[PDB]
Write an enzyme that holds these catalytic residues in place. Structure first.
Site, PDB file in Angstrom:
ATOM      1  N   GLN A 198       2.646  40.092  47.302  1.00  0.00           N
ATOM      2  CA  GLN A 198       3.313  40.702  48.493  1.00  0.00           C
ATOM      3  C   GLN A 198       2.345  40.730  49.688  1.00  0.00           C
ATOM      4  O   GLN A 198       1.145  40.467  49.540  1.00  0.00           O
ATOM      5  CB  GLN A 198       3.785  42.127  48.156  1.00  0.00           C
ATOM      6  CG  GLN A 198       4.880  42.649  49.077  1.00  0.00           C
ATOM      7  CD  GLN A 198       4.411  43.767  49.999  1.00  0.00           C
ATOM      8  OE1 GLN A 198       4.106  44.872  49.544  1.00  0.00           O
ATOM      9  NE2 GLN A 198       4.359  43.485  51.305  1.00  0.00           N
ATOM     10  N   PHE A 199       2.867  41.047  50.869  1.00  0.00           N
ATOM     11  CA  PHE A 199       2.043  41.090  52.075  1.00  0.00           C
ATOM     12  C   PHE A 199       1.267  42.387  52.246  1.00  0.00           C
ATOM     13  O   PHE A 199       1.838  43.478  52.223  1.00  0.00           O
ATOM     14  CB  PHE A 199       2.903  40.870  53.320  1.00  0.00           C
ATOM     15  CG  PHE A 199       2.128  40.910  54.604  1.00  0.00           C
ATOM     16  CD1 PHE A 199       1.097  40.005  54.838  1.00  0.00           C
ATOM     17  CD2 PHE A 199       2.426  41.854  55.580  1.00  0.00           C
ATOM     18  CE1 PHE A 199       0.374  40.038  56.031  1.00  0.00           C
ATOM     19  CE2 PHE A 199       1.712  41.895  56.771  1.00  0.00           C
ATOM     20  CZ  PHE A 199       0.681  40.981  56.997  1.00  0.00           C
TER      21      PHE A 199
ATOM     22  N   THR B 298       7.945  40.722  55.348  1.00  0.00           N
ATOM     23  CA  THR B 298       7.036  40.158  54.311  1.00  0.00           C
ATOM     24  C   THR B 298       7.685  38.910  53.774  1.00  0.00           C
ATOM     25  O   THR B 298       8.874  38.888  53.488  1.00  0.00           O
ATOM     26  CB  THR B 298       6.794  41.127  53.139  1.00  0.00           C
ATOM     27  OG1 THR B 298       6.036  42.270  53.592  1.00  0.00           O
ATOM     28  CG2 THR B 298       6.040  40.399  52.007  1.00  0.00           C
ATOM     29  N   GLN B 299       6.889  37.860  53.635  1.00  0.00           N
ATOM     30  CA  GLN B 299       7.409  36.593  53.188  1.00  0.00           C
ATOM     31  C   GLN B 299       6.391  35.850  52.343  1.00  0.00           C
ATOM     32  O   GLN B 299       5.432  36.432  51.853  1.00  0.00           O
ATOM     33  CB  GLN B 299       7.800  35.776  54.425  1.00  0.00           C
ATOM     34  CG  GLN B 299       6.812  35.877  55.586  1.00  0.00           C
ATOM     35  CD  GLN B 299       7.161  34.909  56.724  1.00  0.00           C
ATOM     36  OE1 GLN B 299       7.719  35.312  57.749  1.00  0.00           O
ATOM     37  NE2 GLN B 299       6.845  33.622  56.536  1.00  0.00           N
TER      38      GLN B 299
ATOM     39  N   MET C  68       5.368  44.255  59.609  1.00  0.00           N
ATOM     40  CA  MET C  68       5.400  43.807  58.223  1.00  0.00           C
ATOM     41  C   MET C  68       6.161  42.491  58.036  1.00  0.00           C
ATOM     42  O   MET C  68       6.749  42.234  56.985  1.00  0.00           O
ATOM     43  CB  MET C  68       6.011  44.902  57.344  1.00  0.00           C
ATOM     44  CG  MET C  68       5.128  46.123  57.221  1.00  0.00           C
ATOM     45  SD  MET C  68       3.514  45.728  56.504  1.00  0.00           S
ATOM     46  CE  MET C  68       3.903  45.740  54.760  1.00  0.00           C
TER      47      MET C  68
END
Lengths: 198, 222, 196, 222, 233, 212, 204, 125, 196, 198
Positions: free
Chosen positions: D1-2, E1-2, E107
């Protein structure tokens, strides 16, 4: 947890242990004696995991009595505590460790001095003027850090404990149902049957 | 850590930086990463330090016993085979990543071993966090048929790339040259380009500065 | 990794790229994936390098002891030993192996032992990450009984394509020719196969 | 995830003198085990005689410093060019930081200057605005290595008057700009020796009633 | 988010006495599949700036559209669009850095590592980096991804500190850059042999070289290597 | 952190330690955990450094606004409820604070309110808040009498925080004392444990374990 | 959770002019609860000193283990074990438990009785030897110790001086660590004599 | 949606809608209040335009805002209900947050504020 | 799924298999994957059927409204609308689309929009699970400016291979020829391409 | 949990509520009154989540008082409990539900009958002779199932509660520090200040 306290005064070591045995939502017993006499001058109190607690106490008691008979001698308090520490230290790295904490109070007839040993389930041993296992220590160490004195008499020690038990009965969330108090000195181990109002 | 191995016309050389770290803290500013398997088989390791060191001494011990038993000089392929089968057995739990080099009755050798047990052969190799900085240098200057001197330079330059550009490496450069006909020559601190400058002040305290509660003599004799 | 074995008129040929990566980093650009377990019984490895090397080393040991007692082993027997090791230890192994060998009675043979530990005898086999890209090409261009020159060409073209599309494959193309005449090692550099 | 956060290393240090103050910081910027730059200023002059450094996740440190500088600019616009006192800047920074209480600027910030009595002043902040005025403070990667030193050499902790039986504490005489620069330099050469994220260069900003001055010193590059 | 899908690898750069050089190969990877080969990852903005991009390609194309718009928009009601008021490399960078940080702050990052290379109006060289976290920094040499680990060590041997800039020529620099690209082609499994290189010189302007190829590779020593330990043939 | 506040014959005693941490890292030994809302209002801090500091400073501004609006000093009840209601709006967001609002007002007399980030608000005579709370309770509870002299009360409070600073790894630094009467609060100094401990040990003969 | 942060504690060793010093704090707690202010972490076998930080039960166990091994060693070798030899014994004893390690940070200090040369060494929990010539640090305040030592240290300090340096290093590092402190003891070792001093320090 | 400025200034500086609002008050039944030394009394008159009402249920003129405060008025009855309800709500809210009932000045200041606000907000008279 | 678009001398051709599976079950064995978004602008879909259909339907809507206002749209414009939808909604979409169209000025063009939403203009493109198996084949056999007959053959062989190795591909092979002459639909049954 | 008990006798409803307020390891208060008067003849006791508990009680109190003033009338016990149930039922499906259980004891002056309503945080309402929230119910429902009688006097009700509290002080693990007892009848709400030994 249960309340396990110990204090070493001038010529004796006093151990106080809560009487409650609670499981879930019910206090099953209110007269439990969380102690085992290892030898005429050495007493051990314990708290911890439901069944491990007594199984460990009795196993230690059995071994000390065996040594006493074999050698027709009584191991010193320091000797017994080292034996207990090693057992716990082995246990912590075994398949299913004994989850038991103990206080060992003994009167060393050779040195003529009382001794109090605190040992957790990891095999961590330390010798102290006063000690406790569980949450109790969080209110009693500073209390005793303030009121304790080296030269105290057994009677002063009992009043000191009373001060501890009152603090615990005031701030602790659980009802531990009072304590059973035992004194270990040059004459052995005796139980103060009158603490329910001393 | 930055370690490299470089083959040359008549032998092989290995080098490594001298920085030991625990997380971001430099524990040993000058540890020695070049280990001896036998007189002429040297090794350099990266990864779990205790592991590279232990695996090196274990095989080293058995290599000595094997040499005494067969009355022959230890062979690099033997150290390679014993190390790899050992590491393989432990499925990578022994975090040892090594570059083993050396000369024996059959010639000069250069190998790399990974924790899981796989081995590689080459003319130039690098391992460790400084692996990439060192390899960039090796891929830029290596050539076949290098002279002992060129090899020492190339290997030395490789560790430097790691010392300067890799945070996991620094301090000095240790080298060990293994030439087919001679004794192996271990060049401890062959380079020392990171000397701490003289401090600006001396912190020597005036005696009595520290408060003491109690004092006594300790008995050493029995 | 891109590896293959092709049977032909005079025997069989094994080929492979020389790239070994740990992530996107090329740990070795000149790896030798053609592994000898006996004089004329070689294998191409894919999967865990630690695993396939341990397997190969044990197989070689078994074939050496086999030879000492019963003489030269058949390619089928070699494929069997690989299989036994891969099947019986399937839970702890990640190994894809192509076994190729030349027998005087059986000529060239190819056996592929994929992940599960099953064995498959085939005219030719391809494996490795880069092989997915050449299933179509190989199927359309493979012919039985090709000549040494044709086989070397089929393999060279097939692998150059695998190297072209698969980032895990690359470097040089190594080949091993196995025939009654003996054992021959071939190598082809990028500047050659890149322009096919 | 980021993961919206990263760690750019670096170490900063601020000491306050009787009529001056200093804010220092190494000039190295890192990511994991690589160096992004050996010279990327991290301590800034924000006007009105205030220096500041927001160390930790650099993108957050830059956004913060940028936002504060703009804050000073508007303070002038909205209050007839009044000078922003250091204490007022501190409270201001607290609100900037606490404004992102639920998605914090991942930085440890320190500012220095002179209070309204001309005395040297240092202020350090917690990632979400917790702040206090102090005599000195180390921030960043080597903070744990340096603060102890500063407690000892700047505030004379644990030091006593020789021969007073540890009864008389070492008096708190105060440091001159020269003595402070020495402690700073020694602090960074020490930090550079033991922490892998510290090095390359040291840049100090000295603030007095005459303004902001800058000094630069090289540091080990390994 | 990707998560990045089609990606571009390293982007390396350095500055020399009269300008800056920046290069990047032409591959567009899809995981381990070397899927696309005619991808230009160097984006020239005006004639004093080149923006090198790595990471997610779909986002790169988005940043391209943004850059074209910046040019169009800067031209609006700007009589000095191709003079005193043309886009400076520093303006282009500050813009992108702003976007990068705003996006990570929501994000939802633009999954890239960017290097902006160019020459300011006063002749000063410009080299600054910004990535998906909005982090930014400058150095005499800058590289992204693999190039950070393998190119910087080589490029820093030419310009280790600021004072090495004036002592470095376009020939030396371009040579260092070309060699670094070869090294990356050797060890980076996501690299391509084909690449573009651009030079922004304060005198000669912007030179943009396309279709370059890594040449002079050493592979011969491979023939001597056999087995993985004991094998002899 | 260890903070306490208790009511007695002579008003209110407020005592706090001054240690700030970041895990096992001692961030500071000189932090102020007491805020002077106004001449007759004190606020204690425990939990998140920033949360406490930020919201209690904000509380002050709210109390001041009340006085401008109502032309009257805000009550301890209403001040504590401003904070209590604020914090309750944020329930679930992760605020972390154990607070005590102590003051005097002709209308309420000496008053103490315990307020925490869970939204709990309690009026009481004695409260100890923080990681060291139990240690303070041990000493304070076993020596407290409603009839303590201002002098004795001030000392108990000081001695209780000392107890906590000694046994609690997360408490320490110095002791900051306060006394609250209907004439407002009176600061009673900053006592560094570094010296306070040894002094108290000698003079009192307690802390008998530690070797001196 | 982390076995190395449950009890707390620190140890530091330094070399001087024909001398070595090894110091340690006295704390033994259980997380936030301080339990004993008399838990020493330095032990000695003959003229070889060993300090041990980490999980208290292992500190105790390892000391009993080395007393046991050095005792047999003396009976067989007919001489007291030397610092260098003991360091190897510690290393192999730790590595022998590679996959079920003792959670400790050992430190060896001493003077080789034959060469008179001062010696110090550290180890990670599985035996990796750290042999520095200046100082060795261990424990919950190790970062702080590294900072103090790197700054305060200088070669060839005389015993009386090394004492001030080691003590200031320990004291100030411990004061920035919640789990260290609560008393300290310093050992100044010389070929002929060994002095042991208890330091006065903050008790919070 | 509707926000027309209904209460605005006229050349002489008057706000006629507020002025005319007062005219509606003059028209309302009379109300008086006098404060003693220990009490306050509120008296109201009862119209007689129509008489045949049910006094039990017909809304009374004096209204309790809280148990210690009352409010009477003169003017539009419908309007007064709105002000009384808001006052009652504010009274409970005040007890809830201040833990003390409102003072009479506070409650007055609140009602007055509501009235003022309706003199300079769009869309309302 | 196996889909491709190939530009040639007279324009461009789109081809696709007809298999749609839900697990190992074939939900539709005669699916029509060639989707019309405009007279001479078609697309091949891969990924989520729900997603690509929703995308295609919206694109068609946009091109219809575009035509009404500005006349026939360029293939580039159609690829742009697909892109906008795929890029901007990348988090909630799983769509791989190949756009192919014939313009009189630009002749045949091919654009591929993979998973991320990026656009790539190419001489020809292949996509779908079955495409991995024909990267080698197509790369070796593709030539620019082929004739209608050659292009139909290239596509027929390429897809028969994809269908051969990929269990997710199968059924018949559909093709759409886009040239100045108009639009032609072709279909090839198993019994024909299975034996190529 | 805290102890919240209620019993409806002949002409009154009695509510008993524990006095302890404990957080973690400490009993912070031992004189807590877990009750709010909603109207002169309606009382509500509550237990549950730390802050939600009082915020809910006071919010309900505020609304009932508002209704009382607006209507110059007192809502019946049944009316108030339905209002409370709806509030809880809305809450259970909101962003952050009120985690509070309540007992509503009221004397309906129109019917001249006491009423006891038990309502959990889900909005589950039931009218009962006696009720309890938490673990208490586990020992008191069967106790009362045995000793309870419809026609009991207020005094008999108090003795019945005493029997309950004694059982709880015997078998419950926690020290709830006794209870505060309140009676709701035709004359309002009054607190039995003498239960610490009745």
């Amino acid at each position: 947890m249960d309340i396990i306290l110990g204090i070493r005064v001038q010529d004796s070591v006093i151990l106080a242990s809560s009487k409650a045995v609670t499981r879930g939502i019910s206090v099953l017993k209110d007269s439990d004696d969380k102690t085992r006499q290892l030898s005429p001058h050495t007493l051990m109190s314990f708290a911890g995991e439901a069944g491990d607690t007594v199984q460990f106490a009795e196993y230690i008691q059995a071994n000390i009595q065996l040594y006493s008979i074999r050698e027709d001698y009584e191991l010193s308090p320091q000797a017994v505590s080292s034996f207990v520490r090693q057992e716990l230290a082995k246990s912590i790295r075994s398949r299913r460790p004994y989850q038991v904490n103990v206080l060992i109070g003994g009167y060393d007839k050779k040195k003529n001095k009382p001794e109090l040993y605190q040992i957790d389930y990891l095999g961590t041993k330390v010798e102290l003027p006063y000690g406790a296992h569980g949450y109790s220590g969080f209110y009693t160490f500073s209390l005793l850090d303030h009121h304790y004195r080296p030269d105290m008499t057994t009677e002063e020690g009992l009043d000191l404990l009373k001060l501890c038990v009152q603090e615990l009965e005031k701030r602790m969330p659980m009802d531990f149902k009072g304590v059973i108090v035992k004194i270990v000195d040059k004459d052995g181990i005796r139980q103060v049957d009158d603490f329910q109002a001393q | 850590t930055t370690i490299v191995g470089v083959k040359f016309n008549n032998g092989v050389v290995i080098a490594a930086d001298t920085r030991s770290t625990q997380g971001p803290i430099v524990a040993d500013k000058n540890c020695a990463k070049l280990h001896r398997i036998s007189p002429k088989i040297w090794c350099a390791g990266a990864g779990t330090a205790a592991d590279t060191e232990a695996v090196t001494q274990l095989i080293g011990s058995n290599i000595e016993l094997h040499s005494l038993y067969t009355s022959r000089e230890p062979r690099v392929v033997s150290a390679l085979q014993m190390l790899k089968q050992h590491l393989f057995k432990y499925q990578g739990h022994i975090g040892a990543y090594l570059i083993v080099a050396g000369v024996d009755p059959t010639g000069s050798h250069l190998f790399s071993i990974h924790a899981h047990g796989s081995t590689d052969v080459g003319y130039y190799l690098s391992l460790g966090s400084g692996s990439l900085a060192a390899m960039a240098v090796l891929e830029s200057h290596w050539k076949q048929d290098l002279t002992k001197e060129e090899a020492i330079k190339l290997a030395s330059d490789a560790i430097q790339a790691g010392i300067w550009n890799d945070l996991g490496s620094g301090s000095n450069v240790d080298v060990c040259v293994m030439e087919i006909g001679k004794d192996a020559e271990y060049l401890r601190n062959y380079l020392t380009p990171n000397v701490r400058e003289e401090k600006q002040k001396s912190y020597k305290f005036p005696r009595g500065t520290t408060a003491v509660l109690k004092e006594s003599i300790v008995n050493i004799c029995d | 990794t891109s590896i293959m074995a092709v049977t032909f008129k005079d025997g069989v040929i094994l080929g492979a790229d020389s790239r070994t990566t740990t992530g996107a980093y090329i740990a070795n650009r000149v790896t030798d994936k053609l592994t000898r377990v006996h004089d004329k019984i070689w294998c191409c490895r894919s999967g865990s390098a630690a695993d396939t090397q341990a397997i190969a080393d044990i197989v070689q040991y078994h074939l050496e002891l086999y030879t000492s007692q019963y003489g030269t082993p058949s390619t089928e027997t070699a494929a069997s030993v690989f299989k036994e090791l891969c099947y019986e230890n399937k839970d702890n192994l990640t190994a894809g192996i192509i076994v190729a060998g030349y027998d005087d009675k059986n000529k060239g043979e190819v056996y592929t032992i994929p992940l599960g530990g099953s064995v498959h005898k085939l005219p030719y086999a391809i494996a490795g990450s880069g092989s997915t890209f050449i299933y179509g090409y190989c199927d359309k261009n493979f012919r039985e009984n090709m000549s040494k020159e044709e086989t070397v060409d089929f393999i060279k073209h097939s692998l150059s394509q695998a190297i072209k599309w698969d980032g895990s494959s690359g470097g040089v193309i190594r080949m091993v020719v196995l025939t009654a005449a003996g054992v021959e090692r071939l190598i082809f550099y990028p500047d050659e196969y890149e322009q096919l | 995830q980021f993961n919206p956060y990263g760690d750019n290393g670096g170490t900063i240090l601020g000491i306050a003198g009787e009529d001056f103050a200093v804010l220092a910081g190494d000039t190295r910027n890192i990511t994991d085990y690589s160096i992004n730059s050996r010279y990327e200023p991290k301590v800034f002059d924000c006007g009105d005689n205030i220096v500041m450094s927001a160390n930790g996740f650099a993108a957050d440190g830059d956004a913060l410093v940028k936002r504060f500088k703009n804050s000073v600019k508007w303070y002038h616009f909205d209050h007839n060019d009044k000078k922003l006192s250091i204490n007022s800047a501190a409270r201001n920074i607290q609100h900037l930081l606490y404004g992102k209480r639920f998605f914090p600027y991942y930085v440890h910030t320190i500012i220095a200057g002179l209070d309204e009595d001309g005395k040297g002043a240092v202020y350090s902040f917690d990632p979400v605005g917790s702040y206090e005025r102090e005599q000195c403070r180390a921030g960043g990667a080597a903070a744990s290595l340096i603060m102890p030193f500063l407690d000892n050499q700047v505030n004379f902790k644990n030091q006593y008057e020789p021969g007073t039986n540890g009864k008389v504490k070492k008096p708190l005489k105060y440091l001159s700009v020269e003595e402070v620069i020495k402690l700073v330099r020694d602090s960074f050469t020490s930090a550079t020796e033991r922490h892998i994220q510290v090095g390359d260069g040291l840049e100090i900003l000295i603030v007095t009633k005459d303004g902001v001055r800058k000094e630069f010193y090289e540091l080990k590059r390994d | 988010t990707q998560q990045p899908i089609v990606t571009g690898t390293s982007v390396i750069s350095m500055k020399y006495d009269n300008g800056v050089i920046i290069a990047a190969d032409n591959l567009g990877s899809y995981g381990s599949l070397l899927r696309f080969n005619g991808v230009e990852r160097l984006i020239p903005v005006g004639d004093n700036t080149v923006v090198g991009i790595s990471g997610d390609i779909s986002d790169m194309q988005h940043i391209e559209r943004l850059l074209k718009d910046l040019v169009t928009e800067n031209a609006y009601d700007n009589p000095l669009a191709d003079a005193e008021e043309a886009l400076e490399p520093s303006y282009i960078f500050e813009y992108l850095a702003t976007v990068m940080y705003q996006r990570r702050s929501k994000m939802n990052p633009l999954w890239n590592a960017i290097i902006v290379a160019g020459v300011q109006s006063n002749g000063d060289q410009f080299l600054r980096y910004v990535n998906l976290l909005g982090v930014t920094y400058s150095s005499p040499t800058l590289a992204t991804g693999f190039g950070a680990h393998m190119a910087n060590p080589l490029l820093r041997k030419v310009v280790d500190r600021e004072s090495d800039i004036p002592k470095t020529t376009v020939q030396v620099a371009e040579e260092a850059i070309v060699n670094a690209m070869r090294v990356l082609y050797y060890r980076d499994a996501r690299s391509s042999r084909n690449f573009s290189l651009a030079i922004i010189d304060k005198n000669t302007g912007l030179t943009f070289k396309k279709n370059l190829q890594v040449e002079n590779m050493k592979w011969d020593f491979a023939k001597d290597i056999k087995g993985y330990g004991t094998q002899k043939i | 952190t260890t903070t306490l506040a208790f009511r007695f014959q002579g008003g209110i005693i407020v005592a706090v330690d001054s240690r700030a941490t970041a895990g096992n890292w001692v961030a500071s030994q000189t932090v102020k955990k007491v805020i002077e809302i106004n001449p007759f209002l004190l606020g204690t801090m425990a939990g998140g450094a920033a949360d406490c500091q930020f919201w209690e400073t904000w509380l002050g501004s709210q109390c001041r606004l009340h006085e401008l609006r109502e032309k009257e000093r805000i009550s301890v009840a209403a001040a504590s409820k401003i904070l209590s209601n604020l914090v309750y709006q944020y329930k679930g967001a992760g605020l972390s604070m154990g607070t005590m609002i102590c003051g005097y007002t002709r209308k309420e007399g000496p008053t103490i309110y315990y307020v925490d980030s869970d939204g709990t608000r309690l009026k009481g005579d004695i409260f100890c808040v923080g990681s060291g709370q139990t240690f303070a309770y041990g000493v304070l509870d076993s020596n407290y009498k409603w009839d303590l002299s201002v002098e004795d009360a001030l000392y108990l409070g000081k001695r209780s925080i000392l107890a906590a600073a000694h046994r609690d790894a997360y408490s320490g630094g110095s002791v900051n004392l306060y006394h609250v009467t209907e004439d407002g609060w009176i600061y009673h100094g900053n006592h560094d444990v570094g010296e306070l401990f040894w002094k108290v040990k000698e003079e009192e003969g307690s802390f008998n374990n530690v070797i001196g | 959770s982390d076995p190395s942060s449950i009890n707390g504690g620190i140890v530091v060793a330094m070399t001087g002019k024909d001398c070595v010093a090894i110091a340690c704090d006295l704390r033994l707690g259980s997380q936030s609860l301080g339990v004993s202010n008399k838990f020493e972490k330095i032990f000695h076998y003959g003229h070889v000193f060993l300090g041990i930080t980490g999980l208290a039960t292992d500190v105790t166990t390892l000391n009993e283990m080395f007393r046991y091994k050095t005792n047999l060693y003396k009976l067989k070798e007919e001489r007291a074990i030397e610092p260098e030899t003991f360091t190897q014994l510690v290393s192999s004893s730790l590595y022998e438990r590679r996959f079920g390690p003792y959670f400790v940070g050992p430190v060896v200090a001493g003077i080789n009785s034959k060469s008179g040369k001062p010696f110090i060494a550290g180890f990670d929990l599985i035996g990796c030897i750290d042999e520095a010539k200046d100082f060795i640090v261990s424990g919950t305040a190790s970062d702080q110790l590294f900072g103090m030592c790197e700054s305060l240290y200088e070669p060839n300090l005389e015993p009386e001086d090394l004492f001030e340096t080691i003590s200031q290093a320990l004291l100030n590092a411990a004061d920035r660590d919640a789990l260290s402190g609560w008393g300290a003891v310093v050992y100044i070792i010389k070929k002929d004599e060994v002095v042991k001093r208890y330091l006065k320090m903050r008790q919070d | 949606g509707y926000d027309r400025a209904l209460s605005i200034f006229s050349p002489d500086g008057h706000i006629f809608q507020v002025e005319y609002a007062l005219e509606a008050v003059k028209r309302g039944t009379c109300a008086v209040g006098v404060k003693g030394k220990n009490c306050v009394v509120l008296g109201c008159e009862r119209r007689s335009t129509l008489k045949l009402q049910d006094t039990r249920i017909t809304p009374s003129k004096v209204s309790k805002i809280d148990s210690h405060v009352v409010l009477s008025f003169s003017g539009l009855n419908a309007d007064s209900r709105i002000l009384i309800e808001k006052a009652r709500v504010e009274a409970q809210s005040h007890r809830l947050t201040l833990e003390d009932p409102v003072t009479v000045e506070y409650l007055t200041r609140y009602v007055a504020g509501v009235q003022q606000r309706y003199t300079q907000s769009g869309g309302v008279r």
